RNA sequence: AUGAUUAGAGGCGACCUAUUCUCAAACUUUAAAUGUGCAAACAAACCGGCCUUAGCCAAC
RNA sequence: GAGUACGACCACACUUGAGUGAAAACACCAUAUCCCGUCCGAUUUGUGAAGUUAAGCACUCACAGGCUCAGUUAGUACUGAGGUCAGUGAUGACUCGGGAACCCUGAGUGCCGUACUCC
RNA sequence: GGGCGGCAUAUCUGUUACACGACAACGCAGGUGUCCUAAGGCGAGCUCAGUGGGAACAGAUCUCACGUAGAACACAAGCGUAAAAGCUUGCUUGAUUAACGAUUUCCAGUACGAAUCGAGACUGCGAAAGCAAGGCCAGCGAUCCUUUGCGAAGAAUA
């Protein structure tokens, strides 16, 4: 059935900087330049901003994550996957991603998290007649790993 | 020590188990007019126009109707006499009373019987008392007695 | 560590059926059906608007204890009988549905020919006349769970009914073409939306290319006659409001008996006992 | 459910899973007996015309 | 025999696993110039009709968990009225009346309105 | 006994209290003379405490799933509340005036304090039905005396 094809729902880029000031502003500018859209600052929980994050979906997200896979050499550990059906990885020295380093902003790291899913997930997020999705229609860890292997390179196995 | 307005109402102004919630639509659509009999039962989920704890569970007569309120007359004994108290409550704390359901049915039955007699119809047969005598033909007969096993089965140890 | 023990279900209280299904806002419903007690249950009506994926439904409803009573209903899937046979969901379709419902209701009540409403749609706000010269028929708007934003098809149906002749209290703060920073309403934009000028512009832009408007392009619909079609539809609806489209094998599965279920369980337990 | 409280067993020292022994004026799903409010046709209630209202309802 | 909109009562209607679904609906679905709103057309708003029953939805099943109505527990626990009743007492039975609860065990798994539509 | 101690001297919640209401002790466990232009009013949008699987520094933040309230509502306690009464946000001043309307609690059916149902004016929020004359329920004061505000300017052969 064509409706069960797995697709990438969204990709979240997060930079937790700590403190607040020039470093946070520079990181926000760098993330905005990288993602081509305005990021959002997130505060602690006790009211000072501590991180900057952004969410990307669609053709831009599909075009992205290629630099992340290239940096990670298209290899990931098994435990990086989650029972929900999503995964992610870290990255350091975004100059490796190739953002044309400038002296104004130093080197920054980031965390990418990719969330996948099938069509029909709207029924759990719409306002009217909100319901729950079927367990069979859910996405399994084995299915996610098989999709990653079929679309990209392989993955190593570990314990922790 | 303390004699506040809502003192000692921990169990009185509380919801029954698994029956919480605000009043339904049937309460909102009920019609109340002057001269009706109502029961004053507080709804603890409204907290507006609540009657005093004394009047919870009393039955009275409506004497005034406002856009959101009802005026009820309640008898209250004080020393050697009975007073007619007039209280003002919101419409969500009253309900129509069935205290005259039996009497109203009695009047309707009398009218129906009167009409049938004038029309010369057939009246229903009259019930007979069960307290009269008669022959009894037994189907099953048993002996009633105290047996030894009755005493042995009374020592749970 | 398991939250769904037996005590959870023992102490669980379920919500109302329509709250669980997610289709009724009961606070709003209580406030909408509430009426002054001194009126002693005089009739009160709500115009309920519901927009589905491929149709829009408008109804005139009075509440009752046994259940709501529907006075008159109009559906968008009857517009082809009155003309326009494409879209059936846009703002012009909403306006036509509202006008048709108002005309049907007035004809049914017999007060027609005394409240002719507005002949030509100018998209201008006129205050409704209410008790709060014989008064018009009144009903209050019910949008359910839909989000109320400027330029919405629920308000399009509202405008259709008002121009038809019913008295629905409202303000022009949500019509298409209201400038919040200026607190003014532009009638030109409202008329353009009512007659579907935006749809015509989009159709022209799409046709000037090299899925959208697939059936539109399959038919010979030219993006220069939509306004005339809608005007003709308004005229036909006004002329003959009571018109519609031209005009038990069982499938239920029988439930097993309790005796049959017990027999099946006994047979299964005998089978496993024998296999052991 | 809240708050106390003894022991063994299974999964796996810890924990979860069902149990197990004993309890609460300021704990309770359930729930008496004795109570307590109202009504049981004569200034009332019931059944079909008429008059008035600056009350309700789009109108009657 | 079914569907949609508005509903009354608010678990016999809930929760977990499976299976089935004629027609028309409902829904997933496509898209972002305009109305509108977001970090993100995700939610929401506008405009459509290339695909699907995969999911939602409806029905059926389970020596399922809950829930509802009965039986048993039991004339037991408790209790109104009485004695120049028994007993050192604690307390108990008796006489004229009222009368429970848990565990355990049976049966069941929504029903009733208005309007429009499909067999 | 009195003294010393302490307020049981005005007053609020749970229990004592005996399934309507009422009920004492220098009985038990605790509170009150404050605080708030928002912590008041309204509309909209969200769902809390916690748990599990994941993501460089990171043994703070991001994401998914479960989650009947196990959180929160200034303060003591009880009750109540889930597309809210909780959290965020936008606009506001119903915390104004209110013709000597009626009523509840204490009770002598007196007052004070607190509270409930209303009619009129001018408003706020909302598309609308509607909601609101403070923060539900403790947080307060007679005679005499002192002190402040309204009897604006204009017009009547009265
Ligand atoms: K007391
Ligand atoms: Mg609303
Ligand atoms: Mg069962
Ligand atoms: Mg008492
Ligand atoms: Mg709200
Ligand atoms: Mg007075
Ligand atoms: Mg006073
Ligand atoms: Mg007023
Ligand atoms: Mg003074
Ligand atoms: Mg003057």
Descriptive terms for the model:
part of a larger assembly, 3 chains, B: about 160 residues, alpha+beta, 5-stranded antiparallel beta sheet, 5 strands, about 20% helix, C: about 280 residues, 4-stranded mixed beta sheet, two-stranded antiparallel ribbon, 10 helices, binds potassium ion, binds magnesium ion, RNA-binding
Topology:
This is part of a larger assembly, with chains A (160 residues), B (157 residues) and C (276 residues).
Chain A: E1 7-16, H1 22-35, E2 40-43, E3 49-56, H2 59-63, H3 66-71, E4 86-91, E5 110-117, H4 141-151
Antiparallel strand pairs in A: 1-3, 1-5, 2-3, 4-5
Chain B: H1 25-28, E1 37-40, E2 58-65, E3 69-78, E4 81-90, E5 94-96, H2 101-119, H3 148-152
Antiparallel strand pairs in B: 1-2, 1-5, 2-3, 3-4
Chain C: H1 6-11, H2 17-21, H3 26-33, E1 46-51, E2 56-62, E3 69-75, H4 91-109, E4 140-142, H5 153-164, E5 178-179, E6 184-185, H6 187-195, H7 197-207, H8 214-218, H9 226-239, H10 258-275
Parallel strand pairs in C: 1-4
Antiparallel strand pairs in C: 1-2, 2-3, 5-6
Helix pairs in contact in C: 4-5, 4-9
Bound molecules: potassium ion (K) and magnesium ion (MG) (9 copies).
Chain C binds 3 RNA strands through α1, α2, α3, β1 and β2.
Subunit structure (chain A): Component of the large ribosomal subunit.
InterPro entries (chain A): Ribosomal_uL5, Ribosomal_uL5_C, Ribosomal_uL5_CS, Ribosomal_uL5_dom_sf, Ribosomal_uL5_N
GO cellular component, one term (chain A): cytosolic large ribosomal subunit
In short:
Chain A has 160 residues and is an alpha+beta fold. Chain A has four helices and five strands; from the N terminus they run βαββααββα.
| Largest interface summary | B-C, 18 and 14 residues
Q: Measured on Cα atoms, how large is the radius of gyration of chain C?
A: 26 Å
Are any ligands bound, and if so which? Answer: potassium ion, magnesium ion
Shape assignment of chain C:
extended
The description of the largest β-sheet of chain A is: 5 strands, antiparallel
Family (chain A): Belongs to the universal ribosomal protein uL5 family.
Subunit structure (chain A): Component of the large ribosomal subunit.
GO cellular component, one term (chain A): nucleus
Protein name (chain A): Large ribosomal subunit protein uL5
Could you describe the 3D structure shown?
This is part of a larger assembly, with chains A (160 residues), B (157 residues) and C (276 residues). Chain A contains four helices and five strands, in the order E-H-E-E-H-H-E-E-H. With 160 residues, chain A is an alpha+beta fold. The N and C termini of chain A lie far apart (36 Å). In chain A, strands 2-3-1-5-4 form a five-stranded antiparallel beta sheet. Chain A has helices at 22-35, 59-63, 66-71, 141-151, and strands spanning 7-16, 40-43, 49-56, 86-91, 110-117. With 157 residues, chain B is α+β, with helices and mostly antiparallel strands. Chain B contains three helices and five strands. Chain B has helices spanning 25-28, 101-119, 148-152; strands spanning 37-40, 58-65, 69-78, 81-90, 94-96. Chain B has a five-stranded antiparallel beta sheet with strand order 4-3-2-1-5, with no helix packed on it. In chain B, a hairpin with a 2-residue loop joins strand 3 and strand 4. Chain B is flat, with a radius of gyration of 27 Å. Chain C is of the alpha+beta class. In chain C, strands 3-2-1-4 form a four-stranded mixed beta sheet, with helices on one face. In chain C, a hairpin with a 4-residue loop joins strand 1 and strand 2. Chain C has ten helices and six strands. Chain C has helices spanning 6-11, 17-21, 26-33, 91-109, 153-164, 187-195, 197-207, 214-218, 226-239, 258-275, and strands at 46-51, 56-62, 69-75, 140-142, 178-179, 184-185. At the B-C interface, helix 1 of B face helix 3 of C. The structure holds potassium ion (K) and magnesium ion (MG) (9 copies). Chain C binds three RNA strands through helix 1, helix 2, helix 3, strand 1 and strand 2. Chain A: Belongs to the universal ribosomal protein uL5 family.
